[PDB]
Design a protein around this ligand. Structure first.
Ligand SMILES: Nc1ncnc2c1ncn2[C@@H]1O[C@H](COP(=O)(O)OP(=O)(O)NP(=O)(O)O)[C@@H](O)[C@H]1O
Ligand SMILES: Nc1ncnc2c1ncn2[C@@H]1O[C@H](COP(=O)(O)OP(=O)(O)NP(=O)(O)O)[C@@H](O)[C@H]1O
Ligand SMILES: Nc1ncnc2c1ncn2[C@@H]1O[C@H](COP(=O)(O)OP(=O)(O)NP(=O)(O)O)[C@@H](O)[C@H]1O
Ligand SMILES: Nc1ncnc2c1ncn2[C@@H]1O[C@H](COP(=O)(O)OP(=O)(O)NP(=O)(O)O)[C@@H](O)[C@H]1O
Ligand SMILES: [Zn+2]
Ligand SMILES: [Zn+2]
Lengths: 619, 619
DNA sequence: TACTGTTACGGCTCCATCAGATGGAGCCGTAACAGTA
DNA sequence: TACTGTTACGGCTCCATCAGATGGAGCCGTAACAGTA
């Protein structure tokens, strides 16, 4: 009737104990980097999967989850966790249809293109329209029909089998994954969903919530990690972590029904839910000053030759259902054209007639939708580009000049100035042939990543390792005088990473922390007073407080005289905009035209847009 | 609250529907080859495992269970099914201790025998008696300690790591497997145990029942297939199949509590439980006539130089705990010595001083404990040796003489007289690269396994395929005149296989059917009136009716003037014996001496033997 | 003289055990060139 | 003349995809030899 976890100390958990009810819809909420993903994925899912698969084949197991740093878990059950630009990965590989087709052509084929090029619906119709062949391929046909039906019911029936999954839209891919993993008709299995509401419109989120409720009604336990109010308002239990983030959080703050979290004063999530902390709605929207940017005849992806006008110098939001061509309209055409015109980028734009008003701008800055790449040779200091300035600082010291050390001698990724015993990693690489790997600190350099000769050179009494092993808040005061490093550190501090260290490995970063690192890196660049900001889904993996910080900095940038366009599905960002362009009304071939356009109130008055009705309800 | 199976037609199931309660101890009983193993293992376990692992890695899945021929299963949960003389398989490989030791020696070893040669207890004591080594091998040590503790608690703490698992006793190996598979502390998992009471004494069965009840109290479902009264008397639900075996059974006869099965008149299991059908206890035991067989100074395995005397010409049973040296005393010494003395076998006997009374015998016949080997090129006719006589019959026909066909032309395992299209298999070998294989009948020979030229030659109006595709009951009348084939078929009929066909592939045979085939093959040999029968666990995988048939034929053989020794743990066989030799009192190094010896009443009067107390309670 | 026991050899089949490689992209570091203020 | 945008190349690391081999034993078929009645 419960899952009792005792002595949970994985990552940043401060030896906490929880009692997660069974056969219930329970969410895990908190700040970015607070401990939700650790507590759920790295402990409960890991223990359940390991315990189940330990009673299985050893070779198959080698081809499981590592043991968490926990004392004991009671009431555990087998766990399934739903939770890349790869050219060699298409719809057929993900849905396994391509494997079935290859096997069928190898077995009963008579010595392909018409099936791969055909859509899901066309292929299903063709399949539905000597008995030895049927006897041989009865199971293949049954599996093909089941997979096609699941994909059609997932809301992505317009896709083609030969299309690459790297270019696949977030909503369609997420729906396909949910249909594949949820459709098993099992009972007594704990399901863990790590942020299952990314790249999904409100209607898609509602359909996913209905599907999850149906799955839970079978007699399962739903443990989802969510940041959206819609998900947390449709659950019977909430486990709130915190009270802060990073080393300042990792313990349970509040627990219970959403009303209990609302009444709880120690929970930031409850305060943001009730309304004690809220994003202020602008009383007076910024009216356009006559400066407009027009694109005529969009013909990229599912574009139906539409005309849209985006004002310059105001807050602009792009809305619509998943697959409605928001990215195709904004990124692939506008960003590429602006980059080619201004930054002299050698990139080919999308299919369009022409764009007016380009001369009104002077610079373009963009944040795409792809996540960042994780590597142990990177940290926030290297990612944001401030590490080069810090290395120049350390090479500008009198000791560095006297000893001849160059600017590249203070980096662990370049030989000649790093601990050669650990190859600059800082820890050894002891690995197990058939067991999860372990981390052992390197005793030659004691984890400082630099040898004695490098650490001898000190700037203001601190060597490179000390400044790498200290947080952004301290670096704000340490580098106050010098303007460039101060600006970069101030951007990192304002984006919300005032607790993280400058040398934390990116592989250990959370999704929200990496997202905020990317946002700070892109927004730390110089603005000339007339700049075009194109943000594509910036509030992903971000709590409402981080969303508030991002909205504040974006509005400060807008007030500085620049223009901002945000492709966001979040109502908090949408309600603060001054001009909303809506696309749709359906994903795929069913949409690609402007359902509505205007100020948020005008779009809300529109009775056709789903976003219009959602905005009317919100306002 | 239930598992609903509809349209179950795997193997010999006649499209039946069952409602198996959840979170209960439910057994599946019936005759040998009735449908228990199919219904449980091939349907419920298969569907549960496939449904769980379909939401897992594709490559790992290739390195699952085939889809059963069922309509739908409701209320399913992930399923774990507990259910060879391999020199390259020891205790370390089964318990995975050897892999851990090899990994530890590769990682922290300083550039083995003392650990492999040491027992489990010695190794545990040694392990329990720079911190970098402990940090590196903390998980390895924890896993080693957990496995050693589980093995010790399983009741097999005296074993050595270097000992081969092929020579491992049944009780110790079964206890180790149960400890390994049961110790996972999971909840909501269906456990399927296929005959978990083979090679186990009554005390070991009781300890296993206690362990299974403890495991079920966690909130799991126990679906065991059992033939022993002790297991079926400790369950809250019984699903009895039948009413016959083979093609005469496969449907549900009775279901409910053991009292309901007792009161049910249509169930054979209930009739045997209540006492309507029972094995008659001999009123007057066969007293020895002075003929005795003495072995002095046994020194094989855990033998403590004991003296035992086995009478000649009476029913003798060997009892004792698992590992008490029953096989070591009887088989390895007596059978080898008798074979070398009489049959001129070139085998080396065990370590003993000498054996008296060998000249009193004239022949030795034995049935060992190892199961039979499964191959698609064998059937009961080939296994029992009657196929050679049938082929000689078919080569003795006038058509065979006229056409020149030899005795080997009527076998599907020899080229030149078989369907070369299917290579004598009778079906094609269509295989899937990553899917379960399928069977397609060969259209060249229509499944008759023989070409037109071979099928032209007919004996008494029937060709070889027709006589191969007909049951033993028909073959009893067909071959009535000829004495050798009549004797072999009569042995096969009396052993209980009056429904099976003469050409059924052994790979499709059940455990009880293969066991009875082996018993018939060994007991069909000629007896000279003074023969020594050494049966080692003959009533394994056999229902009480098959046990009754075997007891009847054994007692007829004894009354014919021969001697029989049975190494059996079954009380039904034991209570009908005339002289019981008990070994023990503990398995492994803790036993190897005669706890008691005498008639069943005298051994029952003994207050030290566990078998004595069990016999006293039974009588 | 035939039936029955053994061994011996050739060919076919099942089962437990051992214990990854590759192409694509993303990131860090350095170099080079051009526009602007 | 310095700051900031781009491209271009070498080296390091993560992730999805492809889609078994071997030694041991057991069984069928045939041959060969020996004991017994
Ligand atoms: N190996 C590690 N050592 C120390 N801290 C770590 C380690 N790995 C992760 N952390 C930190 O632990 C905190 C919790 O991370 P995690 O639990 O994965 O994220 P989360 O709370 O689900 N947040 P987010 O994904 O951003 O919504 C973060 O501040 C991480 O930087
Ligand atoms: N390379 C491509 N070629 C053809 N069609 C594509 C391609 N990439 C995406 N599409 C389709 O174009 C439509 C719009 O996709 P896109 O505009 O990228 O999504 P989006 O609006 O950002 N939606 P989402 O990411 O879910 O919020 C969808 O039906 C996609 O499947
Ligand atoms: N492929 C098949 N086609 C037809 N009959 C089959 C096939 N496989 C197995 N059988 C028969 O189906 C019957 C049920 O076998 P099975 O269910 O495996 O045994 P069981 O009832 O558990 N008995 P046992 O193991 O002897 O205690 C037996 O008579 C088998 O010979
Ligand atoms: N080859 C061997 N070398 C040494 N010890 C052995 C060997 N085979 C078995 N043993 C041990 O000798 C003891 C008796 O085994 P054995 O007499 O073969 O079993 P059993 O009496 O038939 N018991 P069971 O089969 O469970 O009913 C056990 O402790 C075995 O582990
Ligand atoms: Zn080092
Ligand atoms: Zn054929």
């Amino acid at each position: 009737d419960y899952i009792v976890v005792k002595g949970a100390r994985e990552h940043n958990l401060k030896n906490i104990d929880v009692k997660i009810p069974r056969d219930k819809f329970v969410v895990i909420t908190g700040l970015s980097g607070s401990g939700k993903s650790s507590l759920a994925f790295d402990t409960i899912y890991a223990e359940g999967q390991r315990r189940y698969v330990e009673s299985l084949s050893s070779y198959a197991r080698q081809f499981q989850m590592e043991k968490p740093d926990v004392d004991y878990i009671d009431g555990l059950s087998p766990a399934i966790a739903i939770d890349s630009r790869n050219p060699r990965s298409t719809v057929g590989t993900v849905t396994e249809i391509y494997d079935y087709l290859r096997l069928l052509f190898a077995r009963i084929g008579t010595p392909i293109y018409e099936v791969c090029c055909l859509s899901i619906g066309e292929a299903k119709e063709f399949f539905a329209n000597t008995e030895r062949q049927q006897l041989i391929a009865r199971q293949i046909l049954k599996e093909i029909n089941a997979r096609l039906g699941f994909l059609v019911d997932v809301g992505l029936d317009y896709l083609t089998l030969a299309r690459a999954a790297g270019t696949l839209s977030g909503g369609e891919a997420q729906r396909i994954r949910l249909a594949t993993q949820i459709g098993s008709g099992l009972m007594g299995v704990i399901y863990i969903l790590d942020e299952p509401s990314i790249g999904l419109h409100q209607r898609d989120n509602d359909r996913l919530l209905r599907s999850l409720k149906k799955l839970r009604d079978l007699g399962n336990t739903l443990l989802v990690v969510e940041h959206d109010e819609d998900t947390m308002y449709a659950s019977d239990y909430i486990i709130d972590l915190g009270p802060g983030a990073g080393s300042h959080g990792g313990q349970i703050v509040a627990e219970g029904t959403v009303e209990e979290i609302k009444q709880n004063p120690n929970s930031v999530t409850g305060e943001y839910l009730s309304g004690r902390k809220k994003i202020e709605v602008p009383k007076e929207r910024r009216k356009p000053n006559g400066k407009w940017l027009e694109i005529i005849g969009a013909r990229e992806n599912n574009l139906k030759n539409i005309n849209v006008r985006i004002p310059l110098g105001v807050f602009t939001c792009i809305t619509g259902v998943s697959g409605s061509g928001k990215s195709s309209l904004i990124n692939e055409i506008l960003y590429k054209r602006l980059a080619a015109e201004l930054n002299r980028a050698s990139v080919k734009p999308g299919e369009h007639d022409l764009i007016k008003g380009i001369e009104y701008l002077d610079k373009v800055i963009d944040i795409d939708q792809s996540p960042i790449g994780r590597t142990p040779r990177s940290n926030p200091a290297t990612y944001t580009g401030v590490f080069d300035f810090i290395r120049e600082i350390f090479a500008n010291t009198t000791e560095a000049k006297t000893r001849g050390y160059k600017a590249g001698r203070f980096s662990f990724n370049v030989k000649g100035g790093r601990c050669e015993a650990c190859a600059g990693d800082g820890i050894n690489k002891i690995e197990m042939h058939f067991l999860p790997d372990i981390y052992v600190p390197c005793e030659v350099c004691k984890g400082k990543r630099y040898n004695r000769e490098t650490l001898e050179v000190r700037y203001k009494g601190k060597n490179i390792a000390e400044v790498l092993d200290m947080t952004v808040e301290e670096a704000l005061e340490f580098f106050k005088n010098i303007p460039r490093i101060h600006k970069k550190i101030e951007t990192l501090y304002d984006v919300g990473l005032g607790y993280i260290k400058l040398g934390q490995s990116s592989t250990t970063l959370s999704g929200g922390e990496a997202q905020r690192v990317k946002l700070a890196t892109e927004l730390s660049r110089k603005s000339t007073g007339k700049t075009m900001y194109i943000l594509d889904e910036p509030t992903t993996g971000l709590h409402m407080a981080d969303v508030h910080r991002l909205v504040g900095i974006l509005h400060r940038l807008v007030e500085a005289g620049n223009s901002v366009v945000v492709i966001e599905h979040n109502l908090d960002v949408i309600k603060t905009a001054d001009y909303i362009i809506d696309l749709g009304p359906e994903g795929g071939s069913g949409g690609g035209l402007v359902v509505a356009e205007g100020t948020p109130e005008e779009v809300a008055k529109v009775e056709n847009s789903y976003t219009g009705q959602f905005l009317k309800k919100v306002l």
